[PDB]
Amino acid sequence: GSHMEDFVRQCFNPMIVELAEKAMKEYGEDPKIETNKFAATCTHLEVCFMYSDGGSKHRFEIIEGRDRIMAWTVVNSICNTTGVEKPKFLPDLYDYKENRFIEIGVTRREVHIYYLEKANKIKSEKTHIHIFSFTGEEMATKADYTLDEESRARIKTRLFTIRQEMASRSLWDSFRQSE
Amino acid sequence: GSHMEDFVRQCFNPMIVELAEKAMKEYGEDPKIETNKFAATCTHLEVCFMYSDGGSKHRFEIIEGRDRIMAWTVVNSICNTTGVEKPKFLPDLYDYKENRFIEIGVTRREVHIYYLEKANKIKSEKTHIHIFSFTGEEMATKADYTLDEESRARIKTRLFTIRQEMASRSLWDSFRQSE
Amino acid sequence: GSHMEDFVRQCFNPMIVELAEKAMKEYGEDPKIETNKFAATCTHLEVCFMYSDGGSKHRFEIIEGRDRIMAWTVVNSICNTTGVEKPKFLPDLYDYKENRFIEIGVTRREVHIYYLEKANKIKSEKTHIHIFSFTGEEMATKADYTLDEESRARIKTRLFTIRQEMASRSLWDSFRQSE
Amino acid sequence: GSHMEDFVRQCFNPMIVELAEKAMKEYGEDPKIETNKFAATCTHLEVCFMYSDGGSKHRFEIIEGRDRIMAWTVVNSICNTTGVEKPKFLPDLYDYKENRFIEIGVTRREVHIYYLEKANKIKSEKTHIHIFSFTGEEMATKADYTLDEESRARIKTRLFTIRQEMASRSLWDSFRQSE
Ligand SMILES: O=C1CCCN1CC[C@H](C[C@H](C[C@@H](CCN1CCCC1=O)N1CCCC1=O)N1CCCC1=O)N1C=CCC1=O
Ligand SMILES: O=C1CCCN1CC[C@H](C[C@H](C[C@@H](CCN1CCCC1=O)N1CCCC1=O)N1CCCC1=O)N1C=CCC1=O
Ligand SMILES: O=C1CCCN1CC[C@H](C[C@H](C[C@@H](CCN1CCCC1=O)N1CCCC1=O)N1CCCC1=O)N1C=CCC1=O
Ligand SMILES: O=C1CCCN1CC[C@H](C[C@H](C[C@@H](CCN1CCCC1=O)N1CCCC1=O)N1CCCC1=O)N1C=CCC1=O
Ligand SMILES: [Mn+2]
Ligand SMILES: [Mn+2]
Ligand SMILES: [Mn+2]
Ligand SMILES: [Mn+2]
């Protein structure tokens, strides 16, 4: 019965909390035990949804938040209709306007560090990467940040707020030092 | 009690399913017996609605999905107020921005083939044709595709997803080979 | 218990029907007895609302549809803050973008005829007039039609549909010849 | 049991009334006793919300209307991510598009007078000020009025309407002469 678990449930929206619970159980993880991961999973969902909401009405397909199987089905349809290359790991969105997949990251360290780790991992000459930290930095492939400034600013604002809420509950250091 | 019938009811939205049922009974067809047609009818409704949703707020009148009589009443009002020519077969939308009717098609073969068949049929020097296939092709009158790229991409994505769902249930070949 | 009364209640939206009933009782008229006026009042409400919906989000103040007293209060605030001249008769909208009041008319005759009658009546060097007929014509002050083409086309479409519905019930001639 | 209290509850939206009640109790004030302040607090909330609604979708963060603590948390996140200077008094919005805080004022006197008082108070070389009166004037830092004309016009309209409602109840002079 952790403080972090109760904190997450009052910080994030109930739909986000339930998608995060569903995602963690799919990969065999327990949200009551791995409560830092529970927070991170919610955070990442939220960001990905605020991101898709920047931009014009039909711009993004949302991959993140779906069941694994359906997410891959949607990736294949997209691959099979734009001719874009099939990613090896599930990305988070597809950008119909620039014809590319996007991998959104959210990190409690240097973006430099998390970007390289993502780059190396997916090795998809194609897929765009976009990282945000909890201290306001972002880093994106070819310095091309996809959305305009006001929509990314909102996300960075929301991340700093989450950090403050954690810190004022004394949960921030345990969260920071378990990434 | 076919697998296809239950598949359609979980693939499409309930409002689409009910309009499709209404349309088939109007033409004396039974959705429980002619289950490929039931799928096609849902598909065509869906596409036509995703199509009207591309574009700016007042752009399209939606003809498809209405009762026959009301659909013709709306066609006549449009004819009677823009001076456009009265079509012989009901189209699916009217484009207020380009002042033309549009016939949307969705095909399980070559678009070349289905386009000619539509052309020949309506013989309306006026009415624009726009076909989509389930393998991502589209074809439109004067190569003028009406909407921008992202809205048509979404439709082609959704069609490929429907195809995958059918195939993973072993319904795809029976659907493909009954068009 | 007229056919026209039941026709109006199934043709127009319930909120429009209730505002029309409220407006007629304010001027001492009975919607069950004066059923042509009941139709016209609904029609005029509808049009004025479809009109305000053309244009960008804050463009119009809606005067029509309010209680008399509140409508005048809103006119005075507008006069008292833009310095525009106080109209003698209640108009239907205010255009914040062009800084003028608008009088919307809907006629079962020549627009030429109804426009002059409106002009003469309000004598407001200032207030813009915009008439629509049920046969698709419109006429506006300085040939300046305020909205773009697609939003006015929709209105003219809806008016022709109302006319057809009346005619197929044999109510059209009585409505036409009582304006 | 004042007339002003009942007037406010029928003039303003219930959500605004409840936020105003919450704000006044936070600063130890009683909405039943200080009924002019209750009106002013509602007015100021309303304006600030109509203001945030002018502009494009992600443009403003809304600070006003939150609990004190959360409002400061949001200010800090914004400061901590845009590098803008921390204000000493809580502002009402943040403008992501121009990267500044905004202090909205609403006054029953000369805007000249209320602007100086605000200027002097916050002494934030940075924060933009935007005053509206109940007689239609506005005044803003560097004559830069943030929103376009139609959105500010709406606000000034609404303020004059509130003034008229008060005056026709004989509450206006007591409200005017207690600011
Ligand atoms: O907080 C808000 C503000 C506006 C509405 N809303 C509710 C939640 C949506 C996300 C959900 C996303 C979720 C919802 C679950 N499902 C399953 C059936 C279809 C659907 O939408 N989806 C969309 C497809 C993939 C996926 O995982 N969104 C974003 C698009 C509209 C919506 O509900 N959202 C959008 C901005 C932030 C946010 O949380
Ligand atoms: O899935 C969604 C996302 C946004 C809302 N929604 C519900 C269904 C609407 C279509 C219906 C169409 C249908 C609805 C039935 N009726 C009868 C009375 C009026 C009305 O709308 N219409 C519109 C006129 C002709 C016709 O057959 N649409 C499209 C426009 C808004 C709406 O409900 N829709 C729009 C995009 C895909 C889709 O399915
Ligand atoms: O059919 C639709 C499609 C979109 C929503 N909707 C419901 C009715 C609204 C009009 C009402 C107007 C009415 C509603 C009654 N009231 C009294 C309290 C505030 C309010 O709105 N108003 C607006 C101020 C003056 C007036 O008479 N509209 C238009 C603006 C949003 C709305 O509800 N509407 C807008 C397009 C056609 C139409 O009928
Ligand atoms: O009258 C209308 C027309 C459109 C919707 N709506 C309801 C009230 C909203 C304000 C509320 C603001 C309030 C609502 C309370 N909360 C607490 C949880 C999140 C939230 O929204 N917020 C937003 C964040 C800070 C704050 O105090 N707004 C403005 C944005 C959408 C909304 O509900 N609003 C927007 C234009 C005038 C107005 O009164
Ligand atoms: Mn990611
Ligand atoms: Mn068709
Ligand atoms: Mn009128
Ligand atoms: Mn203020």
Side-chain angles (χ1 to χ4, degrees), chain A residues 1-17 19-67 69-84 86-87 89-115 117-125 127-148 150-153 155-176 178-179, chain B residues 1-17 19-67 69-84 86-87 89-115 117-125 127-148 150-153 155-176 178-179, chain C residues 1-17 19-67 69-84 86-87 89-115 117-125 127-148 150-153 155-176 178-179, chain D residues 1-17 19-67 69-84 86-87 89-115 117-125 127-148 150-153 155-176 178-179:
Chain A
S2 72
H3 189 160
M4 177 60 93
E5 190 192 340
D6 293 343
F7 167 71
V8 159
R9 301 184 186 291
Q10 67 96 65
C11 178
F12 296 95
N13 168 275
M15 176 203 94
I16 290 179
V17 166
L19 299 176
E21 295 173 312
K22 238 174 139 127
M24 288 180 65
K25 279 144 167 160
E26 163 107 80
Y27 293 111
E29 311 156 335
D30 183 347
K32 305 190 173 305
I33 283 152
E34 295 223 39
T35 63
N36 299 308
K37 224 139 158 220
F38 188 29
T41 304
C42 294
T43 299
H44 180 262
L45 284 157
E46 187 165 9
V47 165
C48 287
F49 299 151
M50 298 171 66
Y51 198 114
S52 55
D53 188 51
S56 64
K57 82 203 150 159
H58 289 167
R59 172 158 179 182
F60 298 106
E61 197 79 60
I62 304 177
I63 309 305
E64 164 68 10
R66 296 182 188 258
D67 298 358
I69 309 298
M70 185 53 65
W72 277 111
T73 298
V74 177
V75 170
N76 299 327
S77 297
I78 285 166
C79 287
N80 273 282
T81 52
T82 66
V84 174
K86 203 158 148 184
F89 305 88
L90 260 197
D92 305 307
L93 312 173
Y94 184 77
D95 192 341
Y96 282 114
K97 187 168 124 87
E98 309 268 11
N99 324 297
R100 65 206 186 195
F101 292 101
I102 307 169
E103 171 50 44
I104 292 173
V106 179
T107 208
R108 296 154 259 156
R109 328 174 281 199
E110 294 259 31
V111 303
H112 327 314
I113 322 233
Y114 192 61
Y115 188 115
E117 289 176 8
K118 282 277 194 227
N120 297 345
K121 192 182 166 220
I122 61 175
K123 271 186 218 82
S124 270
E125 317 321 61
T127 302
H128 208 78
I129 293 168
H130 202 137
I131 311 311
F132 299 89
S133 60
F134 287 90
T135 62
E137 307 121 317
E138 60 185 327
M139 174 164 156
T141 309
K142 298 188 277 210
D144 163 355
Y145 295 95
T146 284
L147 311 177
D148 72 11
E150 301 84 339
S151 322
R152 286 181 259 140
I155 288 168
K156 297 170 180 162
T157 293
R158 165 77 177 147
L159 295 168
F160 206 84
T161 295
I162 288 170
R163 172 183 192 182
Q164 286 176 87
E165 296 302 309
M166 290 187 184
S168 90
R169 296 169 164 77
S170 314
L171 307 177
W172 173 257
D173 298 328
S174 182
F175 182 59
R176 164 151 43 202
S178 95
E179 145 147 5
Chain B
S2 72
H3 189 160
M4 177 60 93
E5 190 192 340
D6 293 343
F7 167 71
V8 159
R9 301 184 186 291
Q10 67 96 65
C11 178
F12 296 95
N13 168 275
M15 176 203 94
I16 290 179
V17 166
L19 299 176
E21 295 173 312
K22 238 174 139 127
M24 288 180 65
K25 279 144 167 160
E26 163 107 80
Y27 293 111
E29 311 156 335
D30 183 347
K32 305 190 173 305
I33 283 152
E34 295 223 39
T35 63
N36 299 308
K37 224 139 158 220
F38 188 29
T41 304
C42 294
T43 299
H44 180 262
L45 284 157
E46 187 165 9
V47 165
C48 287
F49 299 151
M50 298 171 66
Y51 198 114
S52 55
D53 188 51
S56 64
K57 82 203 150 159
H58 289 167
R59 172 158 179 182
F60 298 106
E61 197 79 60
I62 304 177
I63 309 305
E64 164 68 10
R66 296 182 188 258
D67 298 358
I69 309 298
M70 185 53 65
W72 277 111
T73 298
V74 177
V75 170
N76 299 327
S77 297
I78 285 166
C79 287
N80 273 282
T81 52
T82 66
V84 174
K86 203 158 148 184
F89 305 88
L90 260 197
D92 305 307
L93 312 173
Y94 184 77
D95 192 341
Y96 282 114
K97 187 168 124 87
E98 309 268 11
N99 324 297
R100 65 206 186 195
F101 292 101
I102 307 169
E103 171 50 44
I104 292 173
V106 179
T107 208
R108 296 154 259 156
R109 328 174 281 199
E110 294 259 31
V111 303
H112 327 314
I113 322 233
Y114 192 61
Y115 188 115
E117 289 176 8
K118 282 277 194 227
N120 297 345
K121 192 182 166 220
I122 61 175
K123 271 186 218 82
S124 270
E125 317 321 61
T127 302
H128 208 78
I129 293 168
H130 202 137
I131 311 311
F132 299 89
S133 60
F134 287 90
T135 62
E137 307 121 317
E138 60 185 327
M139 174 164 156
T141 309
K142 298 188 277 210
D144 163 355
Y145 295 95
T146 284
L147 311 177
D148 72 11
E150 301 84 339
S151 322
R152 286 181 259 140
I155 288 168
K156 297 170 180 162
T157 293
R158 165 77 177 147
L159 295 168
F160 206 84
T161 295
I162 288 170
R163 172 183 192 182
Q164 286 176 87
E165 296 302 309
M166 290 187 184
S168 90
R169 296 169 164 77
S170 314
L171 307 177
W172 173 257
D173 298 328
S174 182
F175 182 59
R176 164 151 43 202
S178 95
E179 145 147 5
Chain C
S2 72
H3 189 160
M4 177 60 93
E5 190 192 340
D6 293 343
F7 167 71
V8 159
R9 301 184 186 291
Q10 67 96 65
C11 178
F12 296 95
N13 168 275
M15 176 203 94
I16 290 179
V17 166
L19 299 176
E21 295 173 312
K22 238 174 139 127
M24 288 180 65
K25 279 144 167 160
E26 163 107 80
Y27 293 111
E29 311 156 335
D30 183 347
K32 305 190 173 305
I33 283 152
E34 295 223 39
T35 63
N36 299 308
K37 224 139 158 220
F38 188 29
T41 304
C42 294
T43 299
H44 180 262
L45 284 157
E46 187 165 9
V47 165
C48 287
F49 299 151
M50 298 171 66
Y51 198 114
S52 55
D53 188 51
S56 64
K57 82 203 150 159
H58 289 167
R59 172 158 179 182
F60 298 106
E61 197 79 60
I62 304 177
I63 309 305
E64 164 68 10
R66 296 182 188 258
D67 298 358
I69 309 298
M70 185 53 65
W72 277 111
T73 298
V74 177
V75 170
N76 299 327
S77 297
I78 285 166
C79 287
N80 273 282
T81 52
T82 66
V84 174
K86 203 158 148 184
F89 305 88
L90 260 197
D92 305 307
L93 312 173
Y94 184 77
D95 192 341
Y96 282 114
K97 187 168 124 87
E98 309 268 11
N99 324 297
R100 65 206 186 195
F101 292 101
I102 307 169
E103 171 50 44
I104 292 173
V106 179
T107 208
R108 296 154 259 156
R109 328 174 281 199
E110 294 259 31
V111 303
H112 327 314
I113 322 233
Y114 192 61
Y115 188 115
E117 289 176 8
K118 282 277 194 227
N120 297 345
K121 192 182 166 220
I122 61 175
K123 271 186 218 82
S124 270
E125 317 321 61
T127 302
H128 208 78
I129 293 168
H130 202 137
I131 311 311
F132 299 89
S133 60
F134 287 90
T135 62
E137 307 121 317
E138 60 185 327
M139 174 164 156
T141 309
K142 298 188 277 210
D144 163 355
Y145 295 95
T146 284
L147 311 177
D148 72 11
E150 301 84 339
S151 322
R152 286 181 259 140
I155 288 168
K156 297 170 180 162
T157 293
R158 165 77 177 147
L159 295 168
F160 206 84
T161 295
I162 288 170
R163 172 183 192 182
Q164 286 176 87
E165 296 302 309
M166 290 187 184
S168 90
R169 296 169 164 77
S170 314
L171 307 177
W172 173 257
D173 298 328
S174 182
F175 182 59
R176 164 151 43 202
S178 95
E179 145 147 5
Chain D
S2 72
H3 189 160
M4 177 60 93
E5 190 192 340
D6 293 343
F7 167 71
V8 159
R9 301 184 186 291
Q10 67 96 65
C11 178
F12 296 95
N13 168 275
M15 176 203 94
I16 290 179
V17 166
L19 299 176
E21 295 173 312
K22 238 174 139 127
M24 288 180 65
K25 279 144 167 160
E26 163 107 80
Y27 293 111
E29 311 156 335
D30 183 347
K32 305 190 173 305
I33 283 152
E34 295 223 39
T35 63
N36 299 308
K37 224 139 158 220
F38 188 29
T41 304
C42 294
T43 299
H44 180 262
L45 284 157
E46 187 165 9
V47 165
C48 287
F49 299 151
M50 298 171 66
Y51 198 114
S52 55
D53 188 51
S56 64
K57 82 203 150 159
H58 289 167
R59 172 158 179 182
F60 298 106
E61 197 79 60
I62 304 177
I63 309 305
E64 164 68 10
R66 296 182 188 258
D67 298 358
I69 309 298
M70 185 53 65
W72 277 111
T73 298
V74 177
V75 170
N76 299 327
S77 297
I78 285 166
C79 287
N80 273 282
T81 52
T82 66
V84 174
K86 203 158 148 184
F89 305 88
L90 260 197
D92 305 307
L93 312 173
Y94 184 77
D95 192 341
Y96 282 114
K97 187 168 124 87
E98 309 268 11
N99 324 297
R100 65 206 186 195
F101 292 101
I102 307 169
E103 171 50 44
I104 292 173
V106 179
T107 208
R108 296 154 259 156
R109 328 174 281 199
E110 294 259 31
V111 303
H112 327 314
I113 322 233
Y114 192 61
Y115 188 115
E117 289 176 8
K118 282 277 194 227
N120 297 345
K121 192 182 166 220
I122 61 175
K123 271 186 218 82
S124 270
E125 317 321 61
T127 302
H128 208 78
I129 293 168
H130 202 137
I131 311 311
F132 299 89
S133 60
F134 287 90
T135 62
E137 307 121 317
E138 60 185 327
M139 174 164 156
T141 309
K142 298 188 277 210
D144 163 355
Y145 295 95
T146 284
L147 311 177
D148 72 11
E150 301 84 339
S151 322
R152 286 181 259 140
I155 288 168
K156 297 170 180 162
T157 293
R158 165 77 177 147
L159 295 168
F160 206 84
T161 295
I162 288 170
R163 172 183 192 182
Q164 286 176 87
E165 296 302 309
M166 290 187 184
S168 90
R169 296 169 164 77
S170 314
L171 307 177
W172 173 257
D173 298 328
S174 182
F175 182 59
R176 164 151 43 202
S178 95
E179 145 147 5

